[PDB]
Design a binder for this molecule. Structure first.
Ligand SMILES: CNc1cc(-c2ccc(OCCCN(C)C)cc2)nc(S(C)(=O)=O)n1
Length: 111
């Protein structure tokens, strides 16, 4: 189940998944913490920001104890983008595309 404790072998898969996402062409808005210059009032709207650089740090530090927690931070990144941005937005579409890529990759890691 997704509650099972992460092993050292699992962490190699998570590193692989994370780097697949960082390399994706649509991932550029999510690579680093949002710069307030790039999004007005972002940190007034979004009370739990998340990004792929923060998850990478968390992976390197063995922050994650069960896969569900890794999935949770990833889903915040997508949730935040879709709440902050209107469905019209190319940033919104970036979340649509990258979340679908994440599901494919997550299914693969689970297998
Ligand atoms: C307008 N709304 C947005 C805008 C952005 C964004 C814009 C610009 C970026 O870097 C541009 C290059 C570096 N830069 C410091 C100048 C990154 C991100 N990201 C979201 S997001 C996380 O919700 O998907 N929403």
């Amino acid at each position: 189940s997704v509650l099972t404790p992460l092993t050292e072998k699992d962490y190699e898969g998570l590193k692989r998944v994370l780097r697949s996402l960082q390399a994706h062409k649509m991932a550029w808005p999510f690579l680093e913490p949002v710069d307030p210059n790039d999004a007005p009032d972002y940190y007034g709207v979004i009370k739990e920001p998340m990004d792929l650089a923060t998850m990478e740090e968390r992976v390197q530090r063995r922050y994650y104890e069960k896969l569900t927690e890794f999935v949770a931070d990833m889903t915040k990144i997508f949730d935040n983008c879709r709440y902050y941005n209107p469905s019209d937005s190319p940033f919104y579409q970036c979340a649509e595309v990258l979340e679908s890529f994440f599901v494919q990759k997550l299914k693969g890691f689970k297998a």
